[PDB]
Amino acid sequence: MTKQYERKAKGGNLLSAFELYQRNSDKAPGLGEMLVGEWFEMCRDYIQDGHVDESGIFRPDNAFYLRRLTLKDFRRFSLLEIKLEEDLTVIIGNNGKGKTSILYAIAKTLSWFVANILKEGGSGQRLSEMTDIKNDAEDRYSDVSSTFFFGKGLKSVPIRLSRSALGTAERRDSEVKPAKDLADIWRVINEVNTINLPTFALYNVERSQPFNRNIKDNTGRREERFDAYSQTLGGAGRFDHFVEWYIYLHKRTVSDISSSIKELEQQVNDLQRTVDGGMVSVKSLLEQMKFKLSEAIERNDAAVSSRVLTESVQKSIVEKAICSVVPSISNIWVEMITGSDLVKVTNDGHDVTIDQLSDGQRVFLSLVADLARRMVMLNPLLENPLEGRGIVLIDQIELHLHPKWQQEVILNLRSAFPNIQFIITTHSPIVLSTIEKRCIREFEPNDDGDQSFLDSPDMQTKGSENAQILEQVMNVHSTPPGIAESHWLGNFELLLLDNSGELDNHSQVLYDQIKAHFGIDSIELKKADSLIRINKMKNKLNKIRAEKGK
């Protein structure tokens, strides 16, 4: 039983090693401590191994990311397959061509990972039986498949979420056990010894809520480590949770535990000496604070034993993450106004508050702040918690963003979160100009859903002109075809072509109206002049050739 398990575990496999550890957990302790400790400390090192490269960025030795996604009869797809890039994948296409469905399916797949990380034997979301099943589909059921990769030990971790329609007359079952196994490893290893956990977040277009300035008071749930999994794959990230957590960090930084435990000890020392003679009535009803001294000792050992970061360090890390990604935000801090605590930011040298932000800055700020908070809570063993594993899905990354901000929305995100696999969808060529061609999966304009591969473009979009990306990749003309004035230059070219090159009456009229509309020094007029000059030169060449001989 263990004979081949030991050999396979030593070869770099943590499924067999985890099985050995689980089988030896309930065995006789004392003499077997070293045997089970070997398996535990090489499964934990499998998750915790990594180096710092020449750039100064920590790279895990076993990166976690999704490799393959297959959608069978899922919505408008008959059979669609995607190969996802390890670092960044962008899905582009026309309206109603998928994209959101793909991110939705990936989120429903990752929900099982999140749920089984949270609770033993947890259950994730499942496909809807009303809208997820493809219409006019003779099979009357749909399934989605995933092939996550978690290092050389686990080259593939299959998942299959399935669902059958109404009176399908048979029920398809989801095979979601390899996710349960991996998340069980993560959860139990974390329980025995704190380890860095991946972050699974989805950011739908439903993240444009107008913000509420009334913050629920800190009941004690936001600074729990497993609150980064609370509604993380649910569309909008919990920005209210971030605001509560940030204000809590500010209070714990301006208060700290070095100036609270000593005062409690001094109060105990004074009260005990006062009640030394007796008359313990002033200690019976004051025993509550003497017990709350021990309660403060509790919930404090976890802050030093788990190697969790200091509150000030977490606040500074989140501040640096927020300011370096949002172009307008220069500094963010918590101020006390009329007693209540509120968060204020700096927009272009002004000190507006959060609910005074625009829809473009506030949504991006909420996305970045939520992601940074989730990484900070889930990665306490890293010097830079933002360099942690995870899969983040973003729908319409350019939402509410000016074209100026779209030129630097990918670089900022990938420099703030280097090890996170970003799977995004976009509708803009300015974002595509900052992304390599290999990272793009495009839906063809003539696609009814029978196609079974999303392919990269055939032009290198990175570093290209806006017009080139808009024409070759997005397949939309540089000039609006519905405007009559946009075809004037082409008509002028045709008129110059059919004639001998001299400006006749029709070409002169066209040139006059082109000058009147676009302007004296517009690009259209300069192009018309260049065509006129080039046709004059062509006619001169023809005349010279004719005069040379017959």
**Non-local CB neighbours of 546 within 8 Å, separated by 6+ positions:** none
188 binds, among its own copies, ligand ADP, none (CB under 5 to 8 A by kind): none
State the nearest-atom distance from the C-beta of 487 to its own copies, in Å. Answer: 9
Counting contacts by CB under 6 A, is residue 75 touching ligand ADP? yes
| Least Cβ distance, residue 168 to its own copies (angstroms) | 15
C-beta closer to its own copies: residue 358 or 452: 358
Indicate which single residue of 274, 522, 539, 542 sits in contact with its own copies (rule: CB under 8 A).
522
Phi, psi of 84 (to 5 degrees): -95, 140
Pick the stretch among 24-32, 131-139, 143-151, 215-223 that binds ligand ADP (CB under 6 A): 131-139
- Nearest residue to 103 (alpha-carbon basis) of 235, 214, 4, 223: 235
Residue 99 binds to ligand ADP (criterion: CB under 6 A): yes
Q: Interface with ligand ADP by CB under 6 A: which range of 129-137, 407-415, 492-500, 506-514?
A: 129-137
Rama region for 111: left / alpha / beta (φ>0; ψ in -120 to 50; rest): alpha
- Cβ–Cβ < 8 Å for 511, 488: no
For its own copies, the binding residue among 408, 414, 451, 532 (CB under 8 A) is: 408
Q: 162 or 535: whose CB is closer to ligand ADP?
A: 162
Contact pick of 11, 29, 32, 403 for its own copies (by CB under 8 A): 403
Q: Measured between alpha carbons, how far is 317 from 386 in angstroms, rounded to an integer? A: 8
When the beta carbons of 359 and 498 are compared against its own copies, the nearer one is 359
Q: Of 60, 66, 85, 97, which lies in the binding site for ligand ADP, with binding defined by CB under 6 A?
A: 97
Among its own copies, ligand ADP, none, partner that 462 touches (CB below 5 to 8 angstroms by kind):
its own copies
* CB 324 to ligand ADP: min, Å: 30
Computed on alpha carbons and rounded to an integer, the radius of gyration of the chain in Å comes to 31
72 touching ligand ADP, by CB under 6 A: no
C-alpha 42/C-alpha 10 separation (Å) is 9
Q: Helices (H), strands (E): how many in the chain?
A: 19, 14
* 446 is an interface residue for ligand ADP by CB under 6 A: no
Using the rule CB under 6 A, give the single segment among 7-15, 96-104, 297-305, 341-349 that binds ligand ADP. Answer: 96-104
Q: Check residue 430 for interaction with its own copies (CB under 8 A).
A: yes
In the list 100, 190, 384, 461, the residue contacting ligand ADP (rule: CB under 6 A) is 100
Read out DSSP for 18-86? HHHHHHHHSS-TTTTHHHHHHHHHHHHHHHH-EEE-TTS-EEESS-EE--EEEEESBTT-SEEEEEPPS
Residue 88 CA to residue 314 CA, distance in Å, equals 26
Footprint of its own copies on 358-377 (CB under 8 A): 359
- Nearest to residue 104, comparing CAs of 135, 134, 125, 79? 125
Is residue 96 close enough to count as binding ligand ADP by CB under 6 A? yes
For the chain, give the residues followed by a break (C–N over 2.5 Å). none
How many other β-carbons are positioned within 10 Å of the β-carbon of residue 262?
A: 10
502 interacts with its own copies by CB under 8 A: no
Residue 21's alpha-carbon distances to 39, 337, 473, 522, in angstroms, are 6, 54, 52, 74
Interface residues with ligand ADP (CB under 6 A) are 75-76, 93, 95-101, 131, 134-135
Residues that bind its own copies (CB under 8 A): 205-206, 208-210, 359, 400, 403-404, 407-408, 411, 430, 433-434, 458-460, 462-468, 474-486, 488, 517-519, 521-524
